[PDB]
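Q: Could you write out the predicted structure for this multi-component system? I'm mainly interested in how the pieces pack against one another.
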Amino acid sequence: ALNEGQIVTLAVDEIIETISAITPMAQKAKKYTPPAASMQRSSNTIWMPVEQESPTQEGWDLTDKATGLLELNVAVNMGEPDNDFFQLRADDLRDETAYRRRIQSAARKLANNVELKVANMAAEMGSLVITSPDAIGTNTADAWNFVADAEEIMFSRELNRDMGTSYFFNPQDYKKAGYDLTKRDIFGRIPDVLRSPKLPVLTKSTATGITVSGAQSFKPVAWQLDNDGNKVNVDNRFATVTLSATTGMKRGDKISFAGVKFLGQMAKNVLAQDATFSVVRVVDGTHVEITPKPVALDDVSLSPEQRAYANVNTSLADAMAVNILNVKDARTNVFWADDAIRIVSQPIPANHELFAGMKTTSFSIPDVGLNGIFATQGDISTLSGLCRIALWYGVNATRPEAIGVGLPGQTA
Amino acid sequence: ALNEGQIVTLAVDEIIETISAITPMAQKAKKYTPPAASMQRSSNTIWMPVEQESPTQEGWDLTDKATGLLELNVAVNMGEPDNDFFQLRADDLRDETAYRRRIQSAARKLANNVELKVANMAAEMGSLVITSPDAIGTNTADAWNFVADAEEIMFSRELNRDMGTSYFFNPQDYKKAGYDLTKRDIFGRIPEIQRQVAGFDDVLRSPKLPVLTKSTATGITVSGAQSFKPVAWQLDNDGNKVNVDNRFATVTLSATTGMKRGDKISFAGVKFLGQMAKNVLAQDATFSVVRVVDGTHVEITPKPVALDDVSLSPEQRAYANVNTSLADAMAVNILNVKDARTNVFWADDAIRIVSQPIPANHELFAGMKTTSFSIPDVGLNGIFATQGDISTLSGLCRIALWYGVNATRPEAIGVGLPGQTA
Amino acid sequence: GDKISFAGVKFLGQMAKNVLAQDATFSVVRVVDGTHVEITPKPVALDDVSLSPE
Amino acid sequence: ANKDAIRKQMDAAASKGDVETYRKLKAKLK
Amino acid sequence: ANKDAIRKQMDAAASKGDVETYRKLKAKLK
């Protein structure tokens, strides 16, 4: 009974509503639209600048304290559109309700993919790891206040830009913490503390007795030469650390070197908490890639422009003990500042009036910040239509030092 | 003191309200609309399509990524109506309250039948049997965590669809697992998009959960190497082409002594797989015998499709849930060793309810007054009829409900059997 | 007023007729003789074959 | 009052035999 | 009623194929 206009409109509407509903975490990540607005279907490594940190400049005359300072960028890749290419059987088009059901089934898979990607990125790339042997409880002597600890370590480190941070609980610890669901919709939103069932489980790390091999100092570099010979920006979101052995290391592991402590990001004062890092790639048997680059305050090699980016009191030393923080399996609780996660989406480049056989419609989801396309085409082989829903987006954990992981019950 | 119109309206309203209120499992099963409405007392064997979950493709180019599928079907037979045939005493018709009480009792009996049918089918066709020699409880030292074990088996077997799972406890085990009923109705629901779609599990309790009787089978072994393939069509006796219910698979065993519809079996050396990635799991594949055809034949509700079968085509191989075929002389490993009250759980679309209007000719015959009605919350279609009988000097009342429940995807229905220690 | 129970006898779900774990508990309302008592719920057995379906 | 009028309409619909109107009026009353 | 009318023009907009107007009228209906 449906005509072509309904086939387009109902489908786009249902996609937008169900993707907006199923994703409570993608709506908290900052939406970043690339200024390029490229018309080509090529995945470009978009380089977003980060906030500029400069040394203290004092005095009337600033000729010596020159304006020249370091500028760093981070990279995001929008790989390929997450498609769902299926068939529109005759039963699906019988009435509006069945068509909504089919389109909702497709866009539910798309939304679950988005949510899994965001949750896994936050859990495997968060650096503000806070652990407690106790479990999360509302108020008890042997209970852990995850929100209070997260807020304290976010404020102490000066990572929040004074507009607040967003905390995400798995449903179990959300119920344990005592947050009520009444007067609130599903996920705990107000129709900010939320709960998401997509939060993964961070498995324990079997690695023991790892030590840092040799003295290692990391410098925030702005550019490097590629193979063609042109200067290319360097993603300062990662650092490669040579260890004694990386056996048992995995992408989700959280480590913290002994004797190495945070600094206030702006004030550069030593914090109580030991410096926490998350490994992102075990590139070699000895080499591992920890997320937040450890830039030491007391490095003589660092120039003041480079030293302005320090986030660690002392550099890595030889035979420095590495402490693994995720000693027990526990479903993660995550939190982050305003810009700690960015969802980069660009409209899918396609023109609709050219080809009569295939009918494409471009839609946007402003609540989440995703750009997609919706295409339908007849098929004589199956005597029905083919439907395709695309979603071109890319998620970036820019400023991974501002993403935190709450790990309760680390008794082992 | 009531009149005919009041009788009809009050009775239908009370039936609808009660049956909507007191059926938690019948509301957790998907409602399937029958293809068409016909005035036939013999409902057609409705062939419901079941679709496998399809992973999302990534690339820009997706040539021939939709047309190639198998598209299996499953059959549901509506059967005969659930009835409630009683006499209406003059006491009940005295006022609205007494009549509403009588109709409420009748509706409670009908909802009992509906929810019992759903529970018995879930327990006798569920094939994700998770077993423990300990009673369900909260202390990890001895007691068994049924919800966590069910979650990990439904996550290892990629049947969850990344959404919620409906759990139904018998009331005693619900009490033991430390689930409270504060700000919840009698069944454990929240009074209040669906919570299941968002991915939140729903834990409920229902008193209609049956007791799975123990099995006396000992030393049963298979006879010959048997491999099963998912076929989509078959030739009937007319020569026409008919669908095949790919759920059930007939297995030849050495003997079937002590085997019944409720039993759970698990062939030795046979393991499950993730339905998407086809990775061999540690858990042994568990099947439920549904019908004992002969002294040496058994039908098991999930069809064991071996991954290593070279005879399988890729479309057939997509329907693989067992790593190896049933080679000769495998033991059956009876799982329901002891009598235990079942705890059941299933995925989103693991049970479906089909109901169509009861064919009737209202006002055609003066003696009998029939009033069709439907229950939108549960999805059942019924009829309400009254007649006067001179033998009993009282009016007869009959409430019929026509519905047919089907356990589509029995591999996604689980049965929890605590205390299987013998 | 004495509350008694019997060794093998168990409750049933009143509507569904499924066996419960709890033993059947009865209360004596009168002691008639030295060998007779009167228990307040009447034990009607499912397995009793002498009973008509009604 | 509104409640009295709605109850009267429910009674009239029930006496007539219209189940749908009775259920709608009952929903309005509650 | 008003809601029936709003459904009428949202159905007309859907038949035309304008997603944004259909969504706006649906939100107005809600």
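A: Regarding packing and overall arrangement: Residues 96-125 of chain B form the longest helix (30 residues).
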